[PDB]
Amino acid sequence: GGVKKPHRYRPGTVALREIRRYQKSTELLIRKLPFQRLVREIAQDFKTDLRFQSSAVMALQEASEAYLVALFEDTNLAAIHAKRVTIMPKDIQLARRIRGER
Amino acid sequence: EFALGGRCLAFHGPLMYEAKILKIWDPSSKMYTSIPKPQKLGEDESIPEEIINGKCFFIHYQGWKSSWDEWVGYDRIRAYNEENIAMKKRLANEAKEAKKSLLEQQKKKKL
Amino acid sequence: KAKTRSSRAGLQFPVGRVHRLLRKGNYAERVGAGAPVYLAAVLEYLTAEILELAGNAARDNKKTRIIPRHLQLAVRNDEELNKLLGRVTIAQGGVLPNIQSVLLPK
Amino acid sequence: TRKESYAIYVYKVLKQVHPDTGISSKAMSIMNSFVNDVFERIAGEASRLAHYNKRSTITSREIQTAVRLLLPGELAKHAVSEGTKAVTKYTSAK
Amino acid sequence: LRDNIQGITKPAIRRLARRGGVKRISGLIYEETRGVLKVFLENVIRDAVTYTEHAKRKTVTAMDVVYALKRQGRTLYGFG
Amino acid sequence: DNIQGITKPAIRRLARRGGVKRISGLIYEETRGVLKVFLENVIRDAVTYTEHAKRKTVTAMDVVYALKRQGRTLYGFGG
């Protein structure tokens, strides 16, 4: 007769819940070691064997997450601009086509 | 047969579900063995009395959380063999027919 | 007995230091006496409004000591300090909590 | 080895404002870099103003034209007011 | 090393975008973003290895990073 | 009202130079306010600079000087 059904939050509730979770966190998101490596291969191209402090990396990250959370933010406004809740690659592009990096 | 941590197929309402055997209960010794070692029931641990006289297994449903973990006797537990898998397929087909009858009655309700 | 220039000016930030710096900064050839006094006066103010606002933020989160986050709130909540510190990215700030109205459930 | 920074000064003005509140060291460094940056911007604009007006000295006047050109909106008025009363007390106490 | 851009995992690119207040991240964004991280991190790090060499230092310093970010406009407080 | 002197066809001409093919009608009056607030930023700084030279007249040099401060340099008028 009555068959079970698991308790699944509707698409979007878990979303907004972790939005409120993450907009109160100040902790960095991109993980450290993965990021650190991002550089050693993004630097090896500019100068060989450039050592890096454990603070340059942390800085070059804080500066990155900060740059990205800003761009995502203008991406969203750009996504809402077309009356849509999905962001698209064009958005990150319109946004950046207006900051003048493109 | 039944082993600690092994596959099993179990009743749950009218249908068959796969489960892990985490504990094996012996009614005579009032005791169960567990996986990370004999031990008795804890303060918050209890078994329903309908099955506690038979050999029980604490089982965990695959694809479902630990809130669904429960003690089952030989009535509700079977070994993971091809006969049980085949009748599991058969009862899955019965649930499929029930869902199809649901679709038929709702589409007649729409008309 | 030698007194400091800050107590002459009634300030807490150092007026002496801000003179040296002004001099070695070579911002200009000659620097007058009152220029480091005024700059220390403005810097302490800006350091104060920002510290006050941070104090208003912290008590709210019931935390004794100010931590870098409290300093972002203070800056992004205020609409002036935000034009000033507007292309600045503070460490461990997070962002002002905000979600758009169309993203809310109906 | 000696590192010059505005540690005890900002701490003082913090107790002058709140004589009950602690401060984080990283947050301190936020304050130190922030006062250094705004000092650089106010002093640079001043240097410029001067070099435009063919002057050669950074008078308290320039720092003002500057504070009113950089600090935005009201933050300025209250900056000026406090800077003018500060230099007034400096000249009154000589 | 090589192709470590994939280290900025999707789970994370999301967490950042989630931080930024987005609710639905289309796929085809996870690739675009990593590209944006690698144009930003490029310029900054480049302007930092130039600062590094000028000082004839080898250890890319956090001090240089901050100065580099300034040049591009994205000043960072918390390090010097 | 001197603001309404920035006429529609003029805002249309700015849009045409800007590559716009259909201008809403409500744009015209949005472009005024945006225009004003911007001029009201340059000219403000233009004058701070002016009253620093104790000059009472403003110069084009002070105008491009205020633009340099804002960020948008203007070549062709001095400096």
Short mmCIF file of C-alpha atoms in Angstrom, two decimals, chain A residues 16 19-20 23-26 62-63 66 69 73 76-77 80 83 85, chain C residues 69 89-100 102-105:
data_model
loop_
_atom_site.label_atom_id
_atom_site.label_comp_id
_atom_site.label_asym_id
_atom_site.label_seq_id
_atom_site.Cartn_x
_atom_site.Cartn_y
_atom_site.Cartn_z
CA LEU A 16 19.68 28.89 -0.57
CA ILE A 19 24.07 30.29 0.34
CA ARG A 20 23.23 31.55 3.83
CA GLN A 23 27.82 34.11 3.03
CA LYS A 24 28.54 33.91 6.76
CA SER A 25 31.78 32.03 6.31
CA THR A 26 34.95 34.02 5.77
CA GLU A 62 42.50 35.78 -0.90
CA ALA A 63 42.89 38.08 -3.81
CA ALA A 66 37.78 38.00 -3.76
CA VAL A 69 33.17 36.34 -5.84
CA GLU A 73 28.13 38.63 -8.32
CA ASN A 76 24.28 36.92 -11.34
CA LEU A 77 22.89 40.39 -11.88
CA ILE A 80 18.76 38.10 -13.67
CA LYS A 83 15.02 37.11 -16.42
CA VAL A 85 18.22 32.19 -12.56
CA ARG C 69 35.42 40.12 9.45
CA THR C 89 39.70 43.74 -0.65
CA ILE C 90 40.06 43.13 3.02
CA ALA C 91 41.48 39.90 4.33
CA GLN C 92 38.98 37.30 5.62
CA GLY C 93 36.00 39.58 5.07
CA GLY C 94 33.48 37.49 3.31
CA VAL C 95 30.87 39.53 1.61
CA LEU C 96 27.90 41.43 2.83
CA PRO C 97 25.16 38.86 3.13
CA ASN C 98 22.72 39.45 0.28
CA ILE C 99 20.42 37.45 -2.00
CA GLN C 100 18.34 38.87 -4.88
CA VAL C 102 13.86 37.02 -7.71
CA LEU C 103 15.89 34.21 -6.12
CA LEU C 104 13.53 34.10 -3.14
CA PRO C 105 10.80 31.43 -3.18
#
